[PDB]
């Protein structure tokens, strides 16, 4: 929603979460699969030099 | 409304601009910030993870 202003003491105003407008959904992160796969493949290729 | 998987309501009383009387406020806090102080089986007596 917003920074709901709640006042404590003489002048201190802290900001806390109000409601949630709409439906709730997950907070996520997205990484491409083929780029991550051949990135791990290249990391394994390079690290196989140090382990025979 | 409905049910949020991560947010508790956590209504608390707080000090107004005068010391004598108290007022009731509310927010919505996240689940990993809220700890159940409990010496019994009480499911509504919660506190912040700060004050320890």
């Amino acid at each position: 929603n917003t920074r709901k202003s709640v006042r404590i003491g003489p002048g201190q105003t802290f900001y806390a979460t109000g409601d949630i407008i709409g439906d709730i959904k997950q907070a996520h992160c997205n990484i491409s699969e083929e780029k991550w796969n051949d990135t791990l493949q290249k990391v394994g290729i390079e690290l196989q030099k140090h382990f025979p | 409304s409905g049910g949020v998987e991560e947010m508790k309501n956590c209504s608390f009383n707080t000090t107004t601009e005068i010391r004598d009387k108290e007022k009731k406020e509310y927010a919505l806090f996240y689940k990993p910030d809220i700890v159940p102080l409990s010496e019994t089986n009480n499911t509504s007596e919660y506190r912040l993870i700060n004050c320890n």
Partner: antibody
């Protein structure tokens, strides 16, 4: 195929409460939103809020203020409206429509994409 | 925050291009691209005819084209027959998870 059926026509008195049902058949109803619209006879269309059949989340339009409650059950695949404090202005026809797709990663509630509708219940008051 | 403005009725000969437009504020049409259009026969349930702003659904002949320009969204129909006599409505994403429907037109054939 995909069908939406509702209850019969209901005649009531002012100040009472009306209940309109809507049964969804042909698809998994727990993955789609369901919106409710209102049609007065001879007027346009008015929109009431949506119901999420998974977690029971609701929204409502303005000038209603929680005087209508929408609930659902996952056993018989039927959505429910409980509208209270009836008035002579509320003589209309109520439709239930299928909305967007529940996706767990973005808010698809406000998407005005209504494909399938019920045949509608006529609610008249004296 | 009322309904979207809409003409009361339209008229047109068969084979004549007819344009229907509805106007909204900056928070309804000018900021979100979710503007759909519905028709209904009198006495029957409404039916979807246009997706988000310009896409056509399945089972629909390529005759209804929708477009938007600023705060105005318009639907253009060419090649009209007697089966297009219906009531046409606008809708949009109004923000804060709310949907506002349009006033509605009536199409008269000649």
């Amino acid at each position: 195929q995909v069908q939406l059926v509702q209850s019969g026509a209901e005649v009531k008195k002012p100040g009472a409460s009306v209940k309109v049902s809507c049964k969804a058949s042909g698809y998994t109803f727990t993955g789609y939103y369901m919106h409710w619209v209102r049609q007065a006879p001879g007027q346009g269309l008015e929109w009431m809020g949506w119901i999420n059949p998974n977690s029971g989340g609701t929204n409502y339009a303005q000038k209603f203020q929680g005087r209508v409650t929408m609930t659902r059950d996952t056993s018989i695949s039927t959505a429910y409206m409980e509208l209270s404090r009836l008035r002579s202005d509320d003589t209309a026809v109520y439709y239930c429509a299928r909305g967007g797709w529940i996706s767990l990663y973005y808010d698809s509630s406000g998407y005005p994409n209504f494909d399938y509708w019920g045949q509608g219940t006529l609610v008249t008051v004296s | 925050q009322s309904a979207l403005t809409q003409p009361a009725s339209v008229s047109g000969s068969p084979g004549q291009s007819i344009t229907i437009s509805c106007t909204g504020t900056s928070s309804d049409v000018g900021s979100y691209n979710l503007v759909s259009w519905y028709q209904q026969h009198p006495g029957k349930a409404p039916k979807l005819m246009i997706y988000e702003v310009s896409k056509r659904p399945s089972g629909v002949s390529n005759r209804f084209s929708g477009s938007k320009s600023g705060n105005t969204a318009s639907l253009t129909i060419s090649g009209l027959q007697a089966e297009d006599e219906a009531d046409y409505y606008c809708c949009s994403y109004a923000g804060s998870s709310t949907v506002i429907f349009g006033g509605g037109t009536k199409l008269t054939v000649l």
